[PDB]
Design a protein around this ligand. Structure first.
Ligand SMILES: CCCCCCCCCCCCCCCCCC(=O)OC[C@H](COP(=O)([O-])OC[C@H](O)COP(=O)([O-])OC[C@H](COC(=O)CCCCCCCCCCCCCCCCC)OC(=O)CCCCCCCCCCCCCCCCC)OC(=O)CCCCCCCCCCCCCCCCC
Lengths: 171, 63
């Protein structure tokens, strides 16, 4: 069949978010609050195109928005954030319930200096709506032409011509 | 019986039996073509209902 069409290595180069999973988990709720729109454009493009090769520009916008998010954290509230993700990072399961005072420090400094509000319980799990400008994929499964079905039955059901026609049975 | 009655009743018998014989020949030919091609109402062995397919957005997008 056809040759698979991959993007080049220069199409995949982007400045990475080189932070740990506890760093990402510490500012996860503010990341969901502040980086909503390009992330949801990307995940809508990802569930509609069903192809990661059709989602590279949206992923690059995701990475750019995440980098601007952590640069906006680092300029204003770097030390309460470091105090908070170190305490998140200590735990094996990385509990949020173990670190509520460092969370209160980080959320206080973030609300005072950056105006960000941490979302309530239930908000990040909402199904939102996304205003895209790309067209809707007309055939994302690349489904070919379907086979035409067998013809249905029609007409009034007349009696059997001369019965069963079973050798001599006249009915 | 009259020769008229026997003669014309014989003709009616011959009509009905020749009609049934040509219908049996067509019965064999229709059965042969529907087993061979499979495009009639007979020999429609079941495939999977596509009403059983879930079309919801799943957990992973590549599907
Ligand atoms: C307005 C409302 C009121 C209207 C009223 C109208 C009616 C008024 C009269 C009321 C009574 C009606 C009775 C039924 C209608 C007539 C049926 C008939 O004669 O069909 C002829 C039928 C075919 O001949 P036909 O000349 O082409 O048709 C004339 C009509 O058009 C026949 O019409 P058809 O073309 O539409 O027939 C369709 C088709 C025509 O037939 C065919 O297409 C041929 C295939 C028939 C079956 C062949 C099977 C062969 C292999 C098995 C053999 C088994 C053993 C034989 C018997 C052993 C002893 C029991 O019939 C069948 O296939 C039916 C199966 C056979 C049963 C016949 C009816 C029996 C009714 C009484 C039962 C009593 C027991 C009888 C003995 C049991 C065995 C029959 O004859 C036979 O098949 C010969 C076998 C004997 C038939 C039974 C005769 C009925 C009266 C029996 C009275 C005496 C009983 C004695 C005591 C019991 C036995 C010890």
């Amino acid at each position: 069949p056809g040759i698979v069409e991959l993007p080049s290595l220069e199409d995949l180069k982007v400045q990475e978010v080189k932070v740990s999973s506890s760093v990402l988990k510490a500012a996860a709720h503010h990341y969901g609050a502040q980086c909503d729109k390009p992330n949801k454009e990307f995940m809508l493009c990802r569930w509609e195109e069903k192809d990661p090769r059709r989602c590279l520009e949206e992923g690059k916008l995701v990475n750019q928005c995440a980098l601007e998010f952590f640069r906006q954290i680092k300029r204003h509230c770097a030390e309460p954030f470091t105090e908070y993700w170190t305490c998140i990072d200590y735990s094996g399961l990385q509990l949020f319930r173990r670190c509520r005072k460092e969370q209160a420090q980080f959320d206080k400094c973030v609300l005072d200096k950056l105006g960000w509000v941490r979302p309530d319980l239930g908000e990040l799990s909402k199904v939102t709506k996304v205003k895209t400008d790309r067209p809707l994929p007309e055939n994302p499964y690349h489904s070919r032409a379907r086979p035409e079905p067998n013809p249905e039955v029609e007409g009034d059901l007349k009696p059997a011509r001369h019965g069963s026609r079973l050798f001599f049975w006249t009915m | 019986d009259a020769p008229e009655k026997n003669y014309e009743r014989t003709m009616a018998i011959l009509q009905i039996e020749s009609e049934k014989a040509e219908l049996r020949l067509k019965e064999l030919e229709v059965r042969r073509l529907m087993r061979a091609k499979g495009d009639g109402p007979w020999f429609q062995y079941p495939t999977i209902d596509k009403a059983l397919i879930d079309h919801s957005p799943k957990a992973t997008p590549d599907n």
